[PDB]
Amino acid sequence: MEAKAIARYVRISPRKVRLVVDLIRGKSLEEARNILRYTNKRGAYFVAKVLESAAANAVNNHDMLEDRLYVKAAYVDEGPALKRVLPRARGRADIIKKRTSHITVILGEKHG
Amino acid sequence: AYSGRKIWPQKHTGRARHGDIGAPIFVGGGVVFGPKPRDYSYTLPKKVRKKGLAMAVADRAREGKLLLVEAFAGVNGKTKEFLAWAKEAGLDGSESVLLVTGNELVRRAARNLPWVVTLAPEGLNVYDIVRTERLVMDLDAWEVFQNRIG
Amino acid sequence: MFAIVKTGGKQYRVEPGLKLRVEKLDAEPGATVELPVLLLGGEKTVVGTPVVEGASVVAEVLGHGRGKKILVSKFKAKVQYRRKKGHRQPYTELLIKEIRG
Amino acid sequence: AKHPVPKKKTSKARRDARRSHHALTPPILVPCPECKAMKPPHTVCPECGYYAGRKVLEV
Amino acid sequence: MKTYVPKQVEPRWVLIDAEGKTLGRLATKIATLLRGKHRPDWTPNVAMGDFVVVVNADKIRVTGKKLEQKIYTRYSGYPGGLKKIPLEKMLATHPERVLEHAVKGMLPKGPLGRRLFKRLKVYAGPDHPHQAQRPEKLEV
Amino acid sequence: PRAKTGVVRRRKHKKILKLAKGYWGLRSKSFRKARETLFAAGNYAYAHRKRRKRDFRRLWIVRINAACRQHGLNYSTFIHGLKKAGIEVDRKNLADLAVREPQVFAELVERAKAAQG
RNA sequence: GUACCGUGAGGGAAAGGUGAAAAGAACCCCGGGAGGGGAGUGAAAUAGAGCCUGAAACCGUGGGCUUACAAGCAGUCACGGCCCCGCAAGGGGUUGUGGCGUGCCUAUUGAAGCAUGAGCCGGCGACUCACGGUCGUGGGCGAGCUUAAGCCGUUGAGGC
RNA sequence: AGUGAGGGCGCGAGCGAUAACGUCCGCGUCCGAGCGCGGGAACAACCGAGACCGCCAGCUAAGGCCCCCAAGUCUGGGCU
RNA sequence: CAGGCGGUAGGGGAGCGUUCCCGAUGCCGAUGAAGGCCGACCCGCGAGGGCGGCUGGAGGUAAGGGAAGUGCGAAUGCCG
Ligand SMILES: [Mg+2]
Ligand SMILES: [Mg+2]
Ligand SMILES: [Mg+2]
Ligand SMILES: [Mg+2]
Ligand SMILES: [Mg+2]
Ligand SMILES: [Mg+2]
Ligand SMILES: [Mg+2]
Ligand SMILES: [Mg+2]
Ligand SMILES: [Mg+2]
Ligand SMILES: [Mg+2]
Ligand SMILES: [Mg+2]
Ligand SMILES: [Mg+2]
Ligand SMILES: [Mg+2]
Ligand SMILES: [Mg+2]
Ligand SMILES: [Mg+2]
Ligand SMILES: [Mg+2]
Ligand SMILES: [Mg+2]
Ligand SMILES: [Mg+2]
Ligand SMILES: [Mg+2]
Ligand SMILES: [Mg+2]
Ligand SMILES: [Mg+2]
Ligand SMILES: [Mg+2]
Ligand SMILES: [Mg+2]
Ligand SMILES: [Mg+2]
Ligand SMILES: [Mg+2]
Ligand SMILES: [Mg+2]
Ligand SMILES: [Mg+2]
Ligand SMILES: [Mg+2]
Ligand SMILES: [Mg+2]
Ligand SMILES: [Mg+2]
Ligand SMILES: [Mg+2]
Ligand SMILES: [Mg+2]
Ligand SMILES: [Mg+2]
Ligand SMILES: [Mg+2]
Ligand SMILES: [Mg+2]
Ligand SMILES: [Mg+2]
Ligand SMILES: [Mg+2]
Ligand SMILES: [Mg+2]
Ligand SMILES: [Mg+2]
Ligand SMILES: [Mg+2]
Ligand SMILES: [Mg+2]
Ligand SMILES: [Mg+2]
Ligand SMILES: [Mg+2]
Ligand SMILES: [Mg+2]
Ligand SMILES: [Mg+2]
Ligand SMILES: [Mg+2]
Ligand SMILES: [Mg+2]
Ligand SMILES: [Mg+2]
Ligand SMILES: [Mg+2]
Ligand SMILES: [Mg+2]
Ligand SMILES: [Mg+2]
Ligand SMILES: [Mg+2]
Ligand SMILES: [Mg+2]
Ligand SMILES: [Mg+2]
Ligand SMILES: [Mg+2]
Ligand SMILES: [Mg+2]
Ligand SMILES: [Mg+2]
Ligand SMILES: [Mg+2]
Ligand SMILES: [Mg+2]
Ligand SMILES: [Mg+2]
Ligand SMILES: [Mg+2]
Ligand SMILES: [Mg+2]
Ligand SMILES: [Mg+2]
Ligand SMILES: [Mg+2]
Ligand SMILES: [Mg+2]
Ligand SMILES: [Mg+2]
Ligand SMILES: [Mg+2]
Ligand SMILES: [Mg+2]
Ligand SMILES: [Mg+2]
Ligand SMILES: [Mg+2]
Ligand SMILES: [Mg+2]
Ligand SMILES: [Mg+2]
Ligand SMILES: [Mg+2]
Ligand SMILES: [Mg+2]
Ligand SMILES: [Mg+2]
Ligand SMILES: [Mg+2]
Ligand SMILES: [Mg+2]
Ligand SMILES: [Mg+2]
Ligand SMILES: [Mg+2]
Ligand SMILES: [Mg+2]
Ligand SMILES: [Mg+2]
Ligand SMILES: [Mg+2]
Ligand SMILES: [Mg+2]
Ligand SMILES: [Mg+2]
Ligand SMILES: [Zn+2]
């Protein structure tokens, strides 16, 4: 039995946020909380929400109890990209690719 | 339906060279050797025509599948009546038939069959003669057929 | 006991009850064949010059087959010459029954 | 400056190979001796406001 | 049918002596003894040669005016990096190298050759610490 | 009638990238880089079937030769005995009982010694 | 003939598809929301509106084999190891050591070339048709062969 | 139909300086199209030889037979 | 049974596949069409054709013939 939360269309670049998700893979639920609560990176916030919404789905939908949870697996898939023109010198223009993420966290009961 | 313009200059762009966007190398551009309209017809030698006509008629004649009628009693306009007359010739639908006659009534009675194709006598042509397993021809329709060929 | 034999181009070291496979021979899928001893070692030793004069290996033709594909492929650059050929080689499986002599 | 420029698309295996060092290091932390909650060393625990065993700010 | 492939070996150790032997013509046999091409099942891609011990490598002899007309070179990396070393200059300084070095040049280069060179143990004088392995007085 | 490319062009690219599996980097990912790589491996096959043939011969000779020198003599002679001795064994089986059945091979040096002179 | 671009005349896009039915997801949970988890609808929700099918490049997570004294068109032939599918024998994936190994196209007397083209992937992309010739050729007729426009018929019928 | 940019080596001549991977003819050959295979370390045209496919089979070719690297540290006579 | 089978420009021959037509008021198809993802299996020298498993959810088109917008890796190609 495993619980799952996914936050989609998060307006932040996967590279940056994946760096965070890697810090908490496999960690205890209580472990991860503090690691996020004090990570000096914008990602943490978003990662945290999913992590917390994940835990809730565990106890409120999937019957499993709070104090056994851990990050069974977690990942960041990329999603669509807000494309925007940035005007450059000599009248050439660029395109700013503003990426987005589909964060997932899978929480699981430590058996025994 | 586009502009004639050179979309950019020849050299110094860095992009490849181009003409108008109508160029069939573009998307949206023209077709290179796309099908215009055409006239797929030709004059077959009139002789070869009628030679084919006989050749096909007689082919059926060999198969036996040719039947010469001289009259149809039960028919007058309704299909059921043609269907009952069909029993005589052993025309059950187990074989496709080419019904040739002048009498509009008979034609109208039977045309609505799947296993039957109606036809005026002038309309005899080798195509229809071959797609049909059988052949059934009015005695004086067969007159013009003969009269046709030679 | 063993023997060297020679069928189809080449030579093999047989032994009774061997599952060996050579080239396409001709006895129907079940017959037999006498196969010439080039040297009959084992406990004995008999050297053939060229061939041992009496000895003989009777083998059971199991059946005939075709080997796995081989992709013969050729290609010469800047001439755009390219050919593709496939090759299944035929053969025959022999049951080594006994060594005569 | 005649404006240098990459010669070849940096291969997949070569860029990830560079990012070998990018990985983060988890914050280092200690229990606050009263509240036992998690807190970075040498800072005043934001849960109560104690450091050196003395209340220092009125959290 | 398939060619025999050896299972794991219990490599023979060999002592060989070097007073009076010609530098080169000794080496070339060490090299074949090293590769193990003297063994009936020798396989190209495996360490399965022999362990070779050399005593009296100082005593190695060479004809001609080689003894000081021959010059070994070594390239330091820098401008002016080429060092040049006479024969006995090498000898009475590092006798070991002289036979040592004439052999590496007879072993295939790359991973296996480098490994095979490793099994050769070279010494000046009549001494060798390998009473342990009990090396054999190979007497070529 | 217009006949659009449709399934065809992809199906043929499929057939290749199948063969290209195992190749490093883009040689297994891109079609155009797989087909090049396959060409090369194609000729490498061919020409190596040949080369493989002489290389087992090559091996065998060393091993025959190595066995011979245990009985004093070399290989270059050991043949000439065997040849004018009328024996006709090939190198594969020669190098076989070389390794496996040394008593028979050692017997074969005899016929050879006795013959060559 | 729009956005949009040009003072202007003029130029000139991209943008189709839930499902048979909206039955378009009430309600609870996490969250500021966004978005998810249950619940419910449906035959299908890996049909959820960014909606049929959902290829390829590209980016991930998990697993197997693998790599820190070895110089390399990236393969290949051989042997061995490990991990799977299997009576068997075999076979799949991986690769340690060994052998061998000068990309593709085009231009060329000549290219691995320090000569040209290509970042990768998908799609669009180049020897056609009409009249007239000339060879071969499959047939009809043969000292002869053939109709054109057109007219009659027909609605994939032909005949004058 | 394509070709009408050829090239290298041997030989025979002119040109050149009995220079050039020079040039231009002649007669051959090979590369071109055999950058497929073995030797010449490497090396289009030098020596061997014209690859239909398969083989863990045999003889030779040029070139070689101390180790890298297959085969003689072969045998008999000399010189440096 | 004997012999031939390197090959660029090029010439000849024989094939596979795509689209659409006659065959079709037919046959296949919700006991699953086309397309998609796999395969270590069968056939073919090959281009390819089948078979089997997962996906997909409404079309498909035989033997035999026909007519073309018919086969991409390169165009500093065009679009994404
Ligand atoms: Mg679980
Ligand atoms: Mg909390
Ligand atoms: Mg409970
Ligand atoms: Mg216009
Ligand atoms: Mg103009
Ligand atoms: Mg450009
Ligand atoms: Mg445009
Ligand atoms: Mg046209
Ligand atoms: Mg009847
Ligand atoms: Mg009709
Ligand atoms: Mg039988
Ligand atoms: Mg017996
Ligand atoms: Mg760091
Ligand atoms: Mg030696
Ligand atoms: Mg000296
Ligand atoms: Mg200096
Ligand atoms: Mg050492
Ligand atoms: Mg001592
Ligand atoms: Mg022999
Ligand atoms: Mg305007
Ligand atoms: Mg509707
Ligand atoms: Mg309520
Ligand atoms: Mg609220
Ligand atoms: Mg919601
Ligand atoms: Mg639900
Ligand atoms: Mg449901
Ligand atoms: Mg479905
Ligand atoms: Mg699924
Ligand atoms: Mg999308
Ligand atoms: Mg929305
Ligand atoms: Mg992947
Ligand atoms: Mg991975
Ligand atoms: Mg390496
Ligand atoms: Mg190298
Ligand atoms: Mg293991
Ligand atoms: Mg496995
Ligand atoms: Mg497996
Ligand atoms: Mg070589
Ligand atoms: Mg040319
Ligand atoms: Mg140019
Ligand atoms: Mg460039
Ligand atoms: Mg391009
Ligand atoms: Mg670019
Ligand atoms: Mg493209
Ligand atoms: Mg005319
Ligand atoms: Mg004619
Ligand atoms: Mg006549
Ligand atoms: Mg006449
Ligand atoms: Mg007449
Ligand atoms: Mg006429
Ligand atoms: Mg009608
Ligand atoms: Mg119509
Ligand atoms: Mg008429
Ligand atoms: Mg008229
Ligand atoms: Mg011409
Ligand atoms: Mg000309
Ligand atoms: Mg010439
Ligand atoms: Mg010439
Ligand atoms: Mg002169
Ligand atoms: Mg070469
Ligand atoms: Mg070739
Ligand atoms: Mg050569
Ligand atoms: Mg060449
Ligand atoms: Mg020829
Ligand atoms: Mg010779
Ligand atoms: Mg060699
Ligand atoms: Mg001597
Ligand atoms: Mg001598
Ligand atoms: Mg003598
Ligand atoms: Mg149809
Ligand atoms: Mg239909
Ligand atoms: Mg069923
Ligand atoms: Mg199914
Ligand atoms: Mg399909
Ligand atoms: Mg299938
Ligand atoms: Mg099955
Ligand atoms: Mg699945
Ligand atoms: Mg059809
Ligand atoms: Mg057809
Ligand atoms: Mg194609
Ligand atoms: Mg290109
Ligand atoms: Mg450019
Ligand atoms: Mg460029
Ligand atoms: Mg663009
Ligand atoms: Zn506290």
UniProtKB/Swiss-Prot annotation, chain A:
CDD domains: Ribosomal_L22. The keyword Ion transport does not apply. GO terms for biological process: translation. GO terms for molecular function: rRNA binding; structural constituent of ribosome. Signal peptide: none annotated. Keywords: Ribonucleoprotein, Ribosomal protein, RNA-binding, rRNA-binding. GO terms for cellular component: cytosolic large ribosomal subunit. The keyword Transit peptide does not apply. Belongs to the universal ribosomal protein uL22 family. Part of the 50S ribosomal subunit. NCBIfam families: rplV_bact. This protein binds specifically to 23S rRNA; its binding is stimulated by other ribosomal proteins, e.g. L4, L17, and L20. It is important during the early stages of 50S assembly. It makes multiple contacts with different domains of the 23S rRNA in the assembled 50S subunit and ribosome. The globular domain of the protein is located near the polypeptide exit tunnel on the outside of the subunit, while an extended beta-hairpin is found that lines the wall of the exit tunnel in the center of the 70S ribosome. This is Large ribosomal subunit protein uL22.
Curated annotation (Swiss-Prot), chain B:
GO terms for molecular function: rRNA binding; structural constituent of ribosome. Signal peptide: none annotated. The keyword Ribonucleoprotein applies. Keywords: Ribonucleoprotein, Ribosomal protein, RNA-binding, rRNA-binding. One of its GO terms (cellular component) is ribonucleoprotein complex. The keyword rRNA-binding applies. It comes from the Bacteria. One of its GO terms (biological process) is translation. One of the primary rRNA binding proteins, this protein initially binds near the 5'-end of the 23S rRNA. It is important during the early stages of 50S assembly. It makes multiple contacts with different domains of the 23S rRNA in the assembled 50S subunit and ribosome. Forms part of the polypeptide exit tunnel. Belongs to the universal ribosomal protein uL4 family. Part of the 50S ribosomal subunit. This is Large ribosomal subunit protein uL4. It comes from Thermus thermophilus (strain ATCC BAA-163 / DSM 7039 / HB27). The chain holds residues 53 to 202 of 205 of the full protein.
Swiss-Prot record, chain C:
GO terms for molecular function: rRNA binding; structural constituent of ribosome. Disulfide bonds: none annotated. InterPro entries: bL21-like, bL21-like_sf, Ribosomal_bL21. It comes from the Bacteria. Keywords: Ribonucleoprotein, Ribosomal protein, RNA-binding, rRNA-binding. The keyword Ribosomal protein applies. GO terms for biological process: translation. Part of the 50S ribosomal subunit. Contacts protein L20. Belongs to the bacterial ribosomal protein bL21 family. NCBIfam families: L21. HAMAP family: Ribosomal_bL21. This is Large ribosomal subunit protein bL21. It comes from Thermus thermophilus (strain ATCC BAA-163 / DSM 7039 / HB27). The gene is rplU.
From Swiss-Prot, chain E:
Disulfide bonds: none annotated. InterPro entries: Ribosomal_uL13, Ribosomal_uL13_bac-type, Ribosomal_uL13_CS, Ribosomal_uL13_sf. GO terms for molecular function: mRNA binding; structural constituent of ribosome. It holds the Pfam family Ribosomal_L13. CDD domains: Ribosomal_L13. Keywords: Ribonucleoprotein, Ribosomal protein. It comes from the Bacteria. One of its GO terms (biological process) is translation. NCBIfam families: rplM_bact. Part of the 50S ribosomal subunit. HAMAP family: Ribosomal_uL13 (MF_01366). This is Large ribosomal subunit protein uL13. It comes from Thermus thermophilus (strain ATCC BAA-163 / DSM 7039 / HB27).
